[PDB]
């Protein structure tokens, strides 16, 4: 039994093709194909339904202490209502999901990690929560129950614009406030997103959900988009799919996130995992993450990377058609001697071997609004 | 890596020997062997740490609604601080996980479920609490972070009754009121169990755990007990335990807890399966959870139940050696010709045909505290 949104009945209504997906029903695609879908919204807007993802709220006064004994970010240096992208990492190194976390100006940290995770991540925040207070601190979680929507594009600030009276203007990438939108109060409204593209993430209370969703989508600029054209953006984008990518057998700087160790924590070596990671980020690590592209058929996941003497030296983690670049895209594992850009390799697809080349992420340049 | 509940230092200072139990670190016995820690909890006193079990609360002014419409009780009908077992049930009338719901004189619903089940249980509750805020409804949900500890026996009335200032002489069985026990402050006390002696359950801030459990192990009567004996006593009790004696395939006539289904509930059809179960409530039911007992070898889970003619019946769902009876007990589903009291019938044991009567439940007679 699939679990359900609160636009589920929406996604029919608007000729949503529905699949299963982490345990929940979700459109894989609507009317239009998932790849105009796709080149729509990096031309206009789209809106994804994420409200499957994990949405919760630390509290009190050891809120920061609990979060950065779980993350690698500088959690402390986030400003009020300034986000970072970070990871859960064990003291393996090992990712146990990304997620971004958030300092809200309201006294508590607003956190949105992954659906597939729920149980994971729930039950770590949980056992810390419970460590720490039996220490005599003062912390704790809260699960939201807000939908979450996500709305893509060059085009999505205007139209979330007409509906908040906030000047979006001063909402830079990764920022956010709480704001009356299209007449639903008590939003959050976050400048992130999974596409590369500028965009926003709408925390909304459950009863003004559909409201919120139909009064977007009323905007010609917008159309609904599903699973697979959120897939081919993020891959475009560069962006890991925790699962396929990046998991608890991959570190940080395996998966080329190094960038995701805080400033701060990273100098001094103190985050979890450090003992695995710092060896690694000084040069003695095996493999990385790196992307790749081909002609012909795509490359998908779970596929053999060979150098040009016959030897297999990875795998690819994800990988498909690039509607954008009309190439195919795709990530994967190879030793560090073959990971410069621009590299040829073998990567085997439908049985047989396709010449392929390494090359730098993001495939598609990204265009986030900073200042 | 197995969650620790706040107890756990504590449980390895008093010899508790930890195993794997739904995802948690606990004592399946401590020094004492666990027949005797059995016997101990019907005389005197144990003290059982259950702080995995998953505690929730419901608010807002149509919570009753929302727990209605998951559950087969007469949940309106509980007066202020008064609780009752009940079900969650599917549209096939099968049973999704037993739990104890309490209707707080505050204005939420405090309710416990299977630490088993918790990721089914939050994500049924949450998804359901999503769509009635999603109907224009007022209702919320959360996740309480309490340890959980069950003083049973004769005398846990007057053990605990040296630590709170409330008379518990007037705190009869399935009440409950909020105590400062043993000067930790905000404890919810119900006088529940699952042994079926009288008995406490205690609601305590993890803050405050150790030392409420250290506190009431100073009196002599007090004795900790673990898993295995935790198993012994229920059964004798004839309490159900979910995954082995009812689960999704067994309604909760079939499962012999009719006396769940509330009158008003029963009248309205208006809780999940109703049209499948109702009927079973005149007679139309194949099968019917019933209490065996045997010398020899103990029966066990998963074994086959034959009349006298050899002919396969049903199958026994949980059975261990009874310490109070000195004989076999066990539970298991039969046709409703062969649940009288007194019922001769064989039961596979160690590949052997053995004899076994079945026996009303519970094995053991119970001493719930009524006024």
């Not at 309201?106 to 419970?130: F, I, P, T």
């Not at 690039?322 to 001697?337: Q, R, T």
């Amino acid at each position: 039994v699939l679990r359900r949104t609160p636009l589920y009945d929406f996604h029919l209504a608007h000729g949503g093709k529905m699949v299963a997906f982490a345990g929940w029903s979700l459109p894989v695609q609507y009317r239009d194909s998932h790849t105009d879908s796709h080149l729509h919204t990096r031309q206009h807007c789209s809106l994804f339904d994420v409200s499957h993802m994990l949405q919760t709220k630390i509290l009190g006064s050891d809120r920061v202490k609990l979060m950065e004994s779980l993350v690698v970010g500088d959690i402390a240096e986030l400003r009020p209502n300034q986000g970072t992208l970070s990871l859960f990492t064990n003291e393996a190194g090992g990712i146990l999901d990304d997620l971004i976390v958030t300092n809200t100006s309201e006294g508590h940290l607003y956190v949105v990690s992954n659906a597939g995770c729920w149980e994971k991540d729930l039950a770590l925040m949980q056992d810390k929560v419970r460590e720490l207070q039996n220490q005599g601190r003062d912390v704790g979680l809260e699960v939201l129950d807000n939908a979450l929507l996500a709305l893509q594009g060059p085009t999505a600030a205007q139209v979330l614009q007409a509906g908040v009276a906030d000047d979006l203007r001063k909402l830079p990438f990764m920022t956010s406030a709480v704001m009356e939108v299209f007449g639903v109060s008590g939003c959050r409204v976050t400048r992130c997103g999974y596409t590369g593209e500028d965009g926003v993430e709408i925390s909304v209370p459950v009863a003004g959900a559909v409201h919120l969703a139909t009064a977007i989508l009323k905007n010609p600029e917008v159309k609904l988009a599903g699973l697979a054209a959120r897939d081919s953006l993020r891959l475009e984008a560069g962006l890991c799919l925790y699962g396929n990518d990046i998991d608890e057998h991959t570190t940080p700087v395996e998966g080329s996130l190094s960038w995701t160790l805080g400033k701060r924590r990273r100098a001094a070596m103190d985050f979890p995992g450090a003992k695995v990671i710092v060896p690694q980020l000084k040069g003695r690590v095996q493999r990385r993450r790196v992307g790749l592209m081909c002609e012909g058929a795509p490359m998908r996941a779970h596929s053999p990377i060979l150098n040009m003497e016959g030897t297999k030296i990875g795998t690819v983690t994800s990988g498909c058609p690039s509607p954008s670049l009309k190439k195919n895209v795709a990530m994967g594992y190879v030793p560090c001697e073959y990971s410069r850009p621009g590299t040829m390799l073998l990567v085997e697809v439908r049985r047989k071997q396709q010449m392929a080349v390494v090359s730098k992420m993001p495939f598609v340049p990204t265009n986030y609004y900073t200042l």
